[PDB]
Write a protein that binds this ligand. Structure first.
Ligand SMILES: CSC[C@H]1O[C@@H](n2cnc3c(N)ncnc32)[C@H](O)[C@@H]1O
Ligand SMILES: [Zn+2]
Ligand SMILES: [Zn+2]
Lengths: 115, 301
């Protein structure tokens, strides 16, 4: 019945004013990409930064099991696009937000499927 | 010069041809730092410039390419160089990385341990090493050829680098090995490349381009390192991050270089010529299987 809730711990730590996880690996790129959230190569547009995926995954970075039942990681081995306004906390961003399964953009940060 | 707009500077051939004695390395712009683009780590910048330079060589780039990256961890527990290599290499390239210390990585598989424990069943198309021990930076001691991981790397290249493959091995004034330089003469071409972002360090990448499995040139490594230091001592390199701002041509082009499994007796001068041009890779095309030896100890009493 007991499993550590790392996501909730980070969220609470953040809301209490804790410094976000640092040393997420930001990539150099053209910033002329598609803007989709999680891609096989950096896809930042003008309003995003692209990061190495593993370095932005709370579970990878904390050395804890992934919630996935098979333990698969959504980010490791890929690149995650973060809005430049949120790039101070890529781990918080990926953990709090969701990718649209239709268009591949972040819900509320690129997804226009509600229009 | 216009060198500031390149990703870095490669050792001019005339320096390779000298017979210098080894001297201490004194870099005029020592201590200067390049101004990195906002939020970019040194090692992302350094690996980007290394890959920008490798784009100018005749690397073989097959389907099902296999790359292994030693010294991939950082004191921060992430792998910036692996992240750049995976960005640079064609999608689907198998990428394995490794380090003494635990780190989290975007590689397809990661082995934690001394590189000497690492074994692989398959051969590799590209070997990258950023392995370094900062204890070698002792200016109070004589600067002799180092063994340790360099002994491993020499043997690993001769045993597991596909003919046609390439390597980039980080060296410095004090972190170097004579046999590794001698092994550069077993490639169709070689150089020592200094990134422009780190030009105030004696660091270089020793690049072997298109492995031939036999000496094309006989290189005396003690002299070649002396030649490398003489070059660095007399050719200040202007710190520059200029090339980081042009990423449009960065990805390594998937050339689909042919892979062939040949026995020794079949490598004629025609094969050697194709290998030399980056047009052929010789190895089996089997599964990629790796392991790390683990020493077992029970310290209970
Ligand atoms: C990227 S900075 C240099 C890296 O080389 C790694 N390294 C140094 N010596 C060895 C070794 N013998 N085996 C494996 N990794 C090594 C270090 O742990 C460091 O992360
Ligand atoms: Zn993860
Ligand atoms: Zn959508």
């Amino acid at each position: 019945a007991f499993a550590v809730d790392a996501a909730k711990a980070y969220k609470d730590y953040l809301a209490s004013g804790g410094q976000p996880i640092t040393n997420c690996v930001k990539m150099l790129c053209t910033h002329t990409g598609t803007g989709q959230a999680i891609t096989v190569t950096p896809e930042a547009n003008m309003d995003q930064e692209s990061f190495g995926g593993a370095s932005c995954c709370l579970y990878c970075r904390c050395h804890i099991d992934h919630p996935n039942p098979k333990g698969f990681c959504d980010l490791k081995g890929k690149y995650v696009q973060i809005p430049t306004t949120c790039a101070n906390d890529p781990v918080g961003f990926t953990l709090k937000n969701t990718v649209c399964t239709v268009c591949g953009m972040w819900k509320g940060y690129g997804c226009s499927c509600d229009q | 010069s216009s060198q500031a707009w390149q990703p870095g500077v490669a050792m001019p051939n005339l320096y390779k041809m000298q017979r210098m004695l080894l001297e201490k390395c004194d870099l005029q712009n020592y201590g200067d730092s390049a101004t990195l683009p906002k939020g970019i780590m040194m090692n992302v910048a350094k690996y980007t410039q290394l890959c920008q330079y490798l784009n100018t060589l005749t690397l073989a780039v097959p389907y099902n390419m296999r790359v292994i990256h030693f010294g991939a961890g950082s004191d921060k527990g992430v792998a910036p160089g692996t992240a750049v290599l995976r960005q640079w290499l064609p999608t689907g390239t198998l990428l394995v990385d490794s380090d003494l210390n635990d780190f989290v990585s975007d590689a397809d598989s990661t082995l934690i341990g001394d590189c000497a424990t690492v074994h692989t069943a398959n051969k590799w198309d590209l070997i990258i090493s950023d392995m370094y021990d900062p204890k070698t930076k002792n200016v109070t001691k004589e600067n002799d050829s180092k063994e340790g991981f360099f002994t491993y790397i020499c043997g690993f290249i001769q045993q597991k680098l596909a003919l046609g493959g390439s390597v980039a091995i980080k060296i410095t004034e004090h972190s170097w090995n004579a046999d590794l330089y001698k092994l550069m003469g077993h490639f169709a071409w070689w150089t020592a490349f200094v990134t422009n972002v780190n030009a105030s360090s004696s660091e270089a990448f020793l690049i072997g381009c298109n492995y031939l499995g036999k000496p094309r040139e006989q290189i005396d490594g003690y002299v070649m390192h002396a030649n490398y230091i003489f070059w660095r001592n007399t050719n200040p390199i202007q710190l520059s991050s200029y090339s980081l701002f042009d990423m449009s041509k960065f990805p390594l082009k998937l050339r689909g270089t042919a892979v062939m499994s040949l026995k020794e007796g079949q490598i004629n001068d025609m094969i050697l010529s194709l290998l030399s041009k980056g047009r052929l890779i010789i190895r089996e095309n089997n599964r990629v299987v790796i392991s790390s030896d683990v020493l077992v100890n029970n310290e209970n009493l």
